[PDB]
């Protein structure tokens, strides 16, 4: 897990509040480029491209012990091998092998 990718994940939460909240109603009216074919708000059209890293692109939920996009269960945040460790400790609730 990379400290620059962990620090970017925090910056994304604080920018989703900034560029991805209360802008969707404006985005619905500024994104039309055929209804009159006239240019009169170009600065506001280039505002929809201001966010580059804080929108649903790049954002992945990842394995919460390695930062890795692979081999994990999002219902626990644990990998397909650390689930064996935690199930052998009773540390994932009710998850068992035999003993039923």
């Amino acid at each position: 897990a990379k400290q620059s990718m962990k620090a970017r994940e925090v910056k994304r939460v604080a920018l989703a509040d900034k560029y991805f909240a209360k802008r969707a109603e404006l985005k619905a009216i500024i994104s039309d480029v055929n209804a009159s074919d006239e240019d009169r708000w170009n600065a506001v059209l280039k505002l929809q491209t201001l966010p580059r890293d804080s929108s649903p692109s790049r954002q992945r939920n990842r394995c919460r012990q390695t930062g890795r996009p692979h081999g994990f269960l999002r219902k626990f945040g644990l990998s397909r091998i650390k689930v064996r460790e935690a199930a052998m400790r009773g540390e994932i609730p009710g998850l068992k092998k035999a003993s039923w």
Binding site: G71, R80, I81, V83, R84, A87, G94, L95, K96, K97, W100
Partner: peptide, 14 residues
């Protein structure tokens, strides 16, 4: 932990 994902073991919740 590496290069075998064909071989698995199964766990259950009810």
């Amino acid at each position: 932990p590496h290069v075998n994902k064909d071989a698995r073991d199964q766990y259950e919740i009810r």
